[PDB]
Ligand binder design. Structure first.
Ligand SMILES: CCCCCCCCCCC(CCCCCCCCCC)(CO[C@H]1O[C@@H](CO)[C@H](O[C@@H]2O[C@@H](CO)[C@H](O)[C@@H](O)[C@@H]2O)[C@@H](O)[C@@H]1O)CO[C@H]1O[C@@H](CO)[C@H](O[C@@H]2O[C@@H](CO)[C@H](O)[C@@H](O)[C@@H]2O)[C@@H](O)[C@H]1O
Ligand SMILES: CCCCCCCCCCC(CCCCCCCCCC)(CO[C@H]1O[C@@H](CO)[C@H](O[C@@H]2O[C@@H](CO)[C@H](O)[C@@H](O)[C@@H]2O)[C@@H](O)[C@@H]1O)CO[C@H]1O[C@@H](CO)[C@H](O[C@@H]2O[C@@H](CO)[C@H](O)[C@@H](O)[C@@H]2O)[C@@H](O)[C@H]1O
Ligand SMILES: CCCCC/C=C/C/C=C/C/C=C\C/C=C\CCCC(=O)O[C@H](COC(=O)CCCCCCCCCCCCCCCCC)COP(=O)(O)O[C@@H]1[C@H](O)[C@H](O)[C@@H](O)[C@H](O)[C@H]1O
Ligand SMILES: CCCCC/C=C/C/C=C/C/C=C\C/C=C\CCCC(=O)O[C@H](COC(=O)CCCCCCCCCCCCCCCCC)COP(=O)(O)O[C@@H]1[C@H](O)[C@H](O)[C@@H](O)[C@H](O)[C@H]1O
Ligand SMILES: CCCCC/C=C/C/C=C\CCCCCCCC(=O)O[C@H](COC(=O)CCCCCCCCCCCCCCC)COP(=O)([O-])OCC[N+](C)(C)C
Ligand SMILES: CCCCCCCCCCCCCCCCCC(=O)OC[C@H](COP(=O)(O)OCCN)OC(=O)CCCCCCCCCCCCCCCCC
Ligand SMILES: CCCCCCCCCCCCCCCCCC(=O)OC[C@H](COP(=O)(O)OCCN)OC(=O)CCCCCCCCCCCCCCCCC
Ligand SMILES: CCCCCCCCCCCCCCCCCC(=O)OC[C@H](COP(=O)(O)OCCN)OC(=O)CCCCCCCCCCCCCCCCC
Ligand SMILES: CCCCCCCCCCCCCCCCCC(=O)OC[C@H](COP(=O)(O)OCCN)OC(=O)CCCCCCCCCCCCCCCCC
Ligand SMILES: CCCCCCCCCCCCCCCCCC(=O)OC[C@H](COP(=O)(O)OCCN)OC(=O)CCCCCCCCCCCCCCCCC
Ligand SMILES: CCCCCCCCCCCCCCCCCC(=O)OC[C@H](COP(=O)(O)OCCN)OC(=O)CCCCCCCCCCCCCCCCC
Lengths: 481, 26, 64, 178, 469, 81, 90
């Protein structure tokens, strides 16, 4: 099969010369395959199901059928299946969103994009600390190359930021994982809640894990790399970085931190709440004085991630469900907003400064309607998954600490402010003098936007539709005596 | 130039025009 | 499995031949016999590694 | 904790800093280009002797003083000592932002050093390799590197404190009717 | 086999004309390969970590030394290929890379000295081996005597290495004056407790360690690396480092040394920071070598270091060979040849290499990310094993400094790739001459090892458990 | 918040401040032997200085390890700043 | 005498593509403003005003939130509380 499929790839490349149709076909097959897996996934069981081991000493190039496990473990539960579905929904759209605007050396570009998607998808399958860490880091060089070669004017500084900041946090995570490795002589996620380290050692291991979380989420005050990296990235990079990669941190909190360091997490929760409240408030206010469209959209993600953090660290079932739902809804809506600012407007005008844009409604009524819809989705209008996630996250946060969550409720207003301030100027007023009339949104751009809006609306009207994969998850991680 | 917050930025320009600001509405 | 080890090692040899063709600015299938030679050689190395590992496991088991 | 003798220890530090600065001045005098005599070594020292002496005084005095005042020995004392040392070294800039930057950042680096144990090599006896590890036996107290399957609930109540889900009795047991 | 090759080569080369040089090297190349594949089975002797004293207790053979010997053979094979095979057949490359008449003999004698250092069980063996390697390395540095920089470098090497050889000799004689012995085997836990040998043993350690150029005595060796011909630099910056470090790893005479801890920290800081402003490729690679030497220096502070040292030194040797080969391959695409000994000097001369040879730049990217430590490349697993070792033994501050140095040195590693993937205005369309099949295959094999070696990690650990436990 | 914190202090404890710091530190360490003409004489002086300083430092450590911490800080300051 | 091989034929690097008409009429003043705003970190300095903002947002505000969050930890329980019952636990 692999031999035959490689021959197929080779011949397609020989004759067409562009690999992108093959990549679109492969990713669509991957999505269908994941849906088939979901069909055969047992929901009345909190055990990992589609398990396999790679690079075992008895079968380094095959699957392990041995009585000793020394390779890298993979498998899924409901939590990981949720994010895997999000990943395979997003990958073909990130291919399709750059269908026409990549012209020089396009085969390499699409290879990088698909590789990054596949690495993230495998990362969600990882069942031990080392396999997780390997797939966690492997995206960094691919992103470095993609941003350096295919990014906008400031893309060298951006590639260096996306490599250096993430490496910086990851190395402290690596310290924590090494300590776990040598202290427990085990690294897997299946039984790691059975090991109870002393409270002191727990407190120390938590710090490394949380520094990595702080850079990857990101949280205040180590967030300042994300606007630069998002602003200078090509569109597929931005879509993957906002829709998928940031969700890896929330997943890491649930999978790597809470089951193992429960008592230390209880001890550290007020500090987390300080950091998340600072993230929400300060980054929301800092967004008000930005002049780059893509920077504004990027800053929005940080505040929503702060709300998700507050939910996921609330020690309540509602908070964890809200954090996951918020992650998924953000994964729908943020790539759509990045598509608008860095895919549609930027491909027509090749500029991102807010002063140039005004009154797009006259010649492009459809784009204005998309902007309005996605803006009110982004600020958590009900019947959108964003509202469900934010509302449940705030409920959990308020229960965990009434004062801190109560103050967190101001995010509704603050997000409304920055987002609607942008959309008011984008749609209203007289058509700008600095730009000439261009085409309204195309069929491909509308297709992508429609997919994302329908997804967020479906989970906004009936969020319960995710519960069949997550009802074990909302109890697996809370620590109550 | 006129307000405290425009003045506070004076060290922050080098070779950018120090413009005296006027509200466009006026 | 020994057969899987041989396939994997031969694939490593194929990758070596491909990369050497590319670095020489040559087409992928430039001298196709080289693919066979490279695959055979790397399969030999993989077989040696497999046999040494098997002997090591045998020794670890015989001290029990 | 019995106190450090701040005065005597600090005087020792003064002597050592003066000696080290003298040695650095001699090396500086030998390595440089241009004409140089035996008296120019302090003339063209760059104040290096003062660097050494002042750093020695600041660090040792502040460390001993903070340790005695708190009646503790831990990394915080080294944080204070590094803060004072950074204050001395950043005074040479003659600029307030740089003085503040040296203060806080040297204090943070030395606090990090003190937190790891205030040593460059290892405390071999305390290390994991020289310590009881793995799963503890029947009912023994858990030590720093040891692992258990269940901790005692009394220990959890003591360490975390009561509240926000931590209770001396599980809820369902306590709310059972009879 | 090595001694035989040296004798036969001296005779054969004496009776040979200067035009036979490359042919002779090719012969020795295949000879070495044969010794590696027909004499490999001797590994069986060391099953269950059996140790053999040999030559009236002058030499020690175990699994560690056998592995180091195999690694040195492999390195010699790779490096001798670079002299025996022409990259291109044009006149310029004949001028750039022509082996001297006696170079192959000097290489084989230096390899003998290295292997004797590794196996040294007595201090007289150690000193004779050290002087053999040192004298050979001076002559290797000097043999391109039309170059002003190489002759000056050889003089500097002779004098600094002589001072350090004197320090080593004085250490050995103080040890003898205290114990009436020339072997570390006479050291016991009781002796170490009873006597203060720390000053003597650290003096020996420092004498050995300054010979491979740790801080603060790093600049002289970096100068020598910059000022030698590039094909000499590939050899002389690797083999001594391996031999000396392997001996110190096997001797374990500096466990929990405060002085070694401080010098290792200084070496990591100097190596990472001092590489940042470098604009010459060989100076950048020399600072990289300094940082990796600091990484390995950390393993001299603890027992049971064998797995992490062997893994690190193997993957580092592979990466060092790969990066020098890539730099050599890129010479064909540069606009300006600086001189015949160092055809390429400045990192900026690699600008736009991706438009001339894309897969060469892919090879560079893989090697650079391995040096940085991105999984699943071999460099990541080397650094992971070192971190496991040092944190098991309580070196917390040093682990933090290791992380910081890794991050800092990533900047100058990425400099190479950064310039190499920028745009250049005049790009290559076609060229009739192809680079050599042999050398391209060797480079590709190294790249593939760096990329896919992790697949064998658990199998390797299984074998290690039966030959080193 | 956006200029003084996000693009002020946070870049100072970030890319801009670290870039400036590393620039000065790297310059200082590479120029540790800058103006000298005879590499032999300077490198020999360095090995003598290293040996003597290590001896005196270890003597200090035998006395009291806390007293040596400021000396090491001063030496690092000399080398990198 | 040391020159690159004559066998090499170098042409120009053209990325190709269709040059679209210029739909944006660039304003130099706006571009200069955007450049000043985007690279402000390169010109930032610690003065009284910027230092005051630094102290309010990176020191004072975190300390207020931290005091609140460590003082009120575990303090409140609200679920189903009735008249006369304490809503506080300490
Ligand atoms: C992600 C950020 C990384 C930065 C944070 C790292 C900070 C490391 C600090 C924590 C830690 C190393 C833990 C390493 C774990 C993995 C390392 C993690 C990765 C490292 C990168 C170092 O603890 C150090 O703390 C310093 C104070 O700050 C002290 O300073 C000095 O204080 C003065 C000297 O007396 C001097 O005046 C001066 O010399 C300094 O002032 C040191 O002496 C002390 O060793 C603690 O380890 C140790 O904990 C103790 C009791 O906890 C353990 O023994 C216990 O004994 C009973 C009670 O004793 C318990 O009943 C028992 O159960 C348990 O057996 C030990 O066996 C050992 O294990
Ligand atoms: C604490 C108490 C600090 C008290 C000092 C205030 C301070 C430190 C701010 C650090 C904040 C650190 C926060 C970081 C986190 C800390 C945890 C900021 O003082 C600032 O005040 C501002 C507003 O007045 C000024 O901005 C603009 O200024 C005007 C231009 O037209 C407009 O009037 C104003 O409208 C603008 O806005 C700045 O110029 C001034 O630097 C320093 O101010 C003073 O210190 C001295 C010595 O170093 C500085 O050097 C001095 O002057 C130099 C030639 O001048 C020479 O070298 C020398 O003669 C001397 O050495 C000066 O800087 C001085 O002024
Ligand atoms: C070619 C040129 C030829 C020239 C030849 C002339 C030179 C002759 C002698 C020079 C020889 C070469 C000199 C080399 C530099 C010497 C530096 C040196 O060895 O490290 C020190 C010397 O520890 C002394 O206790 C020794 C302390 C030094 C002696 C005191 C200084 C006296 C000077 C008086 C003024 C070794 O302790 P160390 O690091 O293991 O440190 C510790 C510590 O010793 C123990 O507490 C721990 O248990 C141990 O584990 C370890 O962690
Ligand atoms: C465990 C780690 C230990 C070892 C792993 C390392 C390597 C793998 C093991 C063995 C390596 C041996 C491989 C032998 C098979 C490799 C192989 O196809 O021949 C060669 C290279 O051959 C070595 O250059 C032979 C060089 C041998 C030395 C390689 C060591 C690296 C490549 O073919 P190729 O089609 O380009 O060769 C053609 C053809 O031979 C000529 O007739 C044509 O005229 C010419 O155009 C040329 O292109
Ligand atoms: C037919 C004859 C061919 C043999 C020629 C060997 C040449 C060595 C040349 C270069 C060194 C490269 C690395 C050597 C591999 C270590 C083997 C071993 O397992 O190392 C162990 C010790 O592990 C260690 O310490 C750690 C080693 C660290 C290795 C790091 C690199 C890993 C990536 C390598 C991936 C393998 C590629 C396979 C391709 C299909 C010693 O094993 P051993 O002493 O029992 O000897 C083996 C039996 N032998 C003599 C017949 C071969
Ligand atoms: C360079 C980065 C670091 C690289 C380190 C990791 C490299 C891994 C290389 C990718 C290969 C992993 C995917 C293939 C393994 C799965 C093969 C398989 O058969 O899974 C076994 C599992 C159980 O199968 P079995 O027990 O045999 O029973 C079958 C009953 N009918 O059957 C199943 O349950 C199905 C499992 C589905 C798993 C989904 C995998 C999605 C991604 C597949 C391709 C990913 C490619 C990534 C490429 C970039 C590199 C990361
Ligand atoms: C930086 C970049 C780093 C890149 C990292 C990529 C590493 C990829 C390593 C590939 C090993 C993982 C392969 C996944 C295993 C999937 C599989 O099972 O393939 C089929 C076959 C073995 O199958 P089997 O063991 O029989 O189990 C199935 C039973 N139902 O498998 C085989 O027969 C072997 C075929 C794979 C050969 C791979 C050759 C290396 C690539 C050239
Ligand atoms: C009569 C004399 C002339 C004829 C000689 C007859 C010899 C008989 C045997 C010939 C070789 C057959 C066995 C080896 C297969 C190699 C086939 C080959 O040429 O390369 C395969 C492929 C490119 O093949 P090709 O379609 O020709 O494309 C060239 C440019 N497009 O390139 C690749 O697929 C590279 C894949 C490498 C990595 C794969 C790892 C996965 C396992
Ligand atoms: C991407 C880049 C991300 C990198 C993240 C930042 C890296 C570190 C930056 C610099 C931090 C410097 C920290 C100095 C700490 C000062 C100190 O003395 O710590 C000691 C303190 C307590 O130590 P102890 O003696 O055990 O007291 C027990 C009483 N409960 O130990 C503590 O309790 C912790 C005090 C500091 C809390 C952590 C600070 C943030 C990390
Ligand atoms: C909390 C404090 C946050 C605000 C202070 C930030 C530090 C700072 O003041 O700026 C960085 C400073 C050099 O910049 P500075 O001179 O202060 O300002 C230039 C124009 N305003 O930096 C310095 O003052 C130099 C201090 C260097 C100390 C390095 C400590 C060791 C580093 C690892 C080795
Ligand atoms: C106890 C033993 C354990 C070890 C702990 C020892 C701690 C103290 C160690 C002291 C050793 C001395 C270190 C010498 C390096 C200092 C070099 C230097 O002076 O650079 C300062 C640099 C000034 O650069 P400048 O451009 O002039 O100012 C504008 C800044 N915006 O100012 C800067 O740019 C710094 C701004 C960055 C702020 C910190 C950045 C993150 C930390 C790195």
């Amino acid at each position: 099969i692999l031999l035959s499929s490689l021959y197929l790839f080779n011949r397609i490349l020989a004759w067409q010369g562009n690999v992108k149709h093959f990549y679109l076909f492969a990713s669509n097959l991957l999505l269908l395959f994941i849906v088939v897996l979901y069909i055969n996934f047992n929901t009345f069981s909190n055990s990992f199901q589609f398990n396999f081991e790679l690079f075992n000493s008895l079968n380094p190039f095959g699957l392990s059928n041995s009585d000793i496990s020394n390779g890298l473990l993979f498998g899924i539960d409901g939590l990981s299946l949720t994010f895997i579905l999000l990943t395979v929904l997003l990958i073909p759209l990130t291919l399709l969103g750059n269908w026409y605007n990549i012209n020089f050396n396009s085969n390499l570009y699409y290879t990088l994009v698909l590789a990054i998607g596949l690495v993230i998808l495998l990362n969600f399958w990882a069942l031990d600390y080392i396999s997780f860490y390997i797939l966690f880091e492997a995206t960094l060089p691919l992103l470095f190359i993609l941003i350096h070669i295919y990014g906008s004017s400031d893309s060298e500084r951006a590639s260096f930021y996306v490599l250096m900041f993430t490496l910086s946090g990851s190395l402290f995570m690596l310290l924590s994982i090494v300590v776990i490795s040598i202290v427990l002589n085990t690294t897997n996620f299946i039984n790691h809640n059975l090991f109870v380290l002393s409270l002191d050692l727990q407190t120390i291991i938590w710090l490394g894990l949380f520094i990595a979380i702080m850079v990857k989420t990101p949280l205040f005050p180590i967030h300042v790399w994300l606007p630069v990296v998002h602003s200078e990235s090509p569109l597929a990079g931005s879509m993957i970085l906002a829709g998928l990669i940031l969700k890896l941190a929330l997943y890491a909190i649930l999978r790597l931190l809470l089951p193992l360091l429960c008592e230390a997490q209880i001890l550290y929760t007020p500090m987390i709440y300080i950091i998340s409240l600072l993230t929400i408030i300060l980054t929301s206010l800092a967004t008000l004085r930005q002049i780059d469209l893509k920077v504004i959209i990027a800053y929005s993600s940080i505040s929503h991630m702060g709300i998700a953090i507050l939910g996921v660290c609330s020690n309540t079932s509602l908070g964890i469900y809200g954090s996951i739902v918020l992650g998924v809804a953000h994964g729908f809506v943020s790539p759509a907003l990045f598509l608008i600012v860095g895919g549609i407007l930027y491909d027509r005008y090749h500029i991102r400064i807010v002063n140039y844009y005004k009154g797009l409604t006259t010649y492009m009524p459809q784009l204005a309607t998309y902007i309005i819809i996605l803006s009110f989705a982004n600020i958590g209008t009900p019947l959108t998954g964003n509202f469900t996630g934010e509302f449940l996250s705030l409920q959990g946060g308020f229960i965990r600490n009434p004062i801190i969550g109560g103050i967190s409720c101001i995010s509704v207003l603050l997000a409304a402010i920055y987002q609607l301030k942008l959309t008011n100027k984008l749609t209203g007023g007289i058509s700008s003098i600095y730009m000439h009339r261009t085409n309204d949104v195309t069929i491909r751009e509308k297709f992508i936007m429609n997919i994302l809006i329908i997804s967020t609306l479906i989970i906004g009207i009936c969020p319960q539709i995710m519960y069949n994969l997550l009802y074990w998850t909302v109890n697996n991680y809370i620590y109550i005596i | 130039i006129r307000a405290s917050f425009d003045k506070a930025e004076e060290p922050m320009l080098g070779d950018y025009p120090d413009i005296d600001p006027f509200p466009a509405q006026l | 499995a020994l057969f899987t080890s041989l396939v994997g090692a031969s694939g490593l040899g194929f990758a070596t031949k491909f990369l050497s063709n590319k670095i020489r600015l040559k087409p992928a299938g430039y001298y196709p016999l080289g693919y066979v030679f490279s695959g055979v050689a790397w399969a030999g190395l993989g077989l040696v590694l497999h046999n040494v590992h098997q002997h090591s496991l045998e020794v670890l088991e015989k001290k029990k | 904790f019995h106190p450090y003798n701040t005065l005597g220890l600090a005087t020792q530090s003064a002597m050592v800093g003066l000696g080290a600065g003298v040695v650095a001045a001699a090396a500086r005098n030998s390595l440089a280009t241009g004409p140089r005599n035996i008296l120019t070594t302090f003339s063209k020292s760059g104040g290096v002797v003062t660097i050494f002496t002042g750093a020695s005084i600041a660090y040792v005095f502040t460390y001993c003083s903070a340790a005695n005042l708190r009646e503790r020995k831990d990394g915080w004392n080294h944080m204070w000592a590094g803060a004072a040392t950074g204050a001395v070294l950043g005074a040479r800039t003659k600029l307030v932002p740089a003085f503040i930057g040296w203060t806080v950042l040297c204090g943070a680096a030395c606090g990090l050093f003190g937190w790891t144990g205030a040593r460059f090599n290892a405390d071999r006896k305390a290390s994991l390799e020289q310590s009881p590890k793995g799963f503890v036996q029947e009912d023994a107290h858990q030590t720093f590197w040891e692992v258990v399957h269940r901790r005692p609930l009394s220990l959890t109540v003591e360490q975390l404190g009561e509240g926000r889900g931590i209770n001396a009795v599980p809820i369902a047991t306590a709310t059972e009717a009879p | 086999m090595l001694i035989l090759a040296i004798i036969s080569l001296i005779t054969f080369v004496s009776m040979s004309k200067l035009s036979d040089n490359r042919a002779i090297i090719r012969l020795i190349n295949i000879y070495l390969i044969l010794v590696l594949v027909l004499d490999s089975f001797l590994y069986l002797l060391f099953l269950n970590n059996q140790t053999y004293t040999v030559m009236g207790e002058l030499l020690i053979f175990n699994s560690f030394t056998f592995y180091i010997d195999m690694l040195i053979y492999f390195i010699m094979i790779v490096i001798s290929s670079l002299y025996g095979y022409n990259l291109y057949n044009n006149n310029l490359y004949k001028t750039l890379f022509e082996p001297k008449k006696e170079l192959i003999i000097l290489f084989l004698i230096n390899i003998l000295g290295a292997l004797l250092i590794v196996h040294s069980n007595d201090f007289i063996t150690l000193f004779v081996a050290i002087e053999l390697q040192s004298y050979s390395i001076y002559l290797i540095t000097a043999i391109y005597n039309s170059s002003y920089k190489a002759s000056k470098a050889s003089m500097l090497y002779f004098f600094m290495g002589g001072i350090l050889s004197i320090l080593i000799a004085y250490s050995i004689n103080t040890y003898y004056s205290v114990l009436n012995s020339y072997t570390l085997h006479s050291l016991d836990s009781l002796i170490i407790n009873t006597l203060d040998l720390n000053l003597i043993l650290i003096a020996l350690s420092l004498g050995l360690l300054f010979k491979i150029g740790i801080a603060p005595l790093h600049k002289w060796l970096i100068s020598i690396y910059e000022n030698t011909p590039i094909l000499i630099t590939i050899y002389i910056s690797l083999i001594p480092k391996i031999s000396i470090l392997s001996y110190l790893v096997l001797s374990n005479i500096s466990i929990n040394s405060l002085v070694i801890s401080i010098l290792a920290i200084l070496t990591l800081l100097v190596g990472s920071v001092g590489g940042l402003l470098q604009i010459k490729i060989k100076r950048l690679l020399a600072f990289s070598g300094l940082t990796n030497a600091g990484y390995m220096m950390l393993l001299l502070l603890l027992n049971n270091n064998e797995f992490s040292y062997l893994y690190y030194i193997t993957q580092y040797s592979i990466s060092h060979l790969a990066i020098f080969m890539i730099i050599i391959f890129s010479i064909y695409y540069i606009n300006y040849i600086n001189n015949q000994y160092n055809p390429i000097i400045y990192v900026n001369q690699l600008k736009g290499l991706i438009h001339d040879n894309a897969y060469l730049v892919l090879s560079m990217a893989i090697v650079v990310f391995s040096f940085i430590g991105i999984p699943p490349l071999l460099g990541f697993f080397g650094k992971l094993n070192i971190l496991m070792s040092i944190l098991n033994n309580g070196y917390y501050f040093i682990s933090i400094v290791l992380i910081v140095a890794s991050l800092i040195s990533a900047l100058y590693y990425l400099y190479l790739l950064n310039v190499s993937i920028q745009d250049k205005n005049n790009i290559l369309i076609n060229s009739n001459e192809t680079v050599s099949s042999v050398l391209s295959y060797i480079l590709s094999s190294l790249i593939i090892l760096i990329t896919f070696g992790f697949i064998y990690n658990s199998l390797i650990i299984d074998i290690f458990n039966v030959y080193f436990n | 918040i956006a200029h003084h914190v996000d693009k002020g202090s946070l870049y100072r404890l970030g890319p801009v401040g670290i870039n400036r710091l590393l620039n000065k530190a790297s310059y200082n360490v590479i120029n540790l032997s800058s103006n000298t003409r005879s590499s032999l004489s300077m490198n020999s002086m360095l090995i003598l200085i290293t040996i003597v300083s290590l001896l005196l430092l270890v003597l200090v450590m035998n006395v009291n390890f806390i007293i040596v911490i400021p000396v090491l800080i001063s030496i690092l300051y000399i080398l990198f700043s | 005498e040391l020159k690159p091989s004559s066998a090499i034929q170098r042409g120009p690097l053209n990325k190709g593509g269709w040059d679209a008409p210029h739909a944006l009429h660039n304003d130099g003043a706006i571009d200069r403003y955007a450049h000043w705003r985007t690279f402000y970190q390169e010109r930032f300095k610690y003065t009284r005003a910027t230092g005051k903002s630094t102290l309010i947002f990176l020191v004072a505000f975190p300390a207020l939130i931290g005091y609140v969050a460590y003082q009120s930890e575990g303090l409140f329980e609200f679920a189903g509380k009735r008249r006369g019952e304490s809503v506080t636990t300490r």
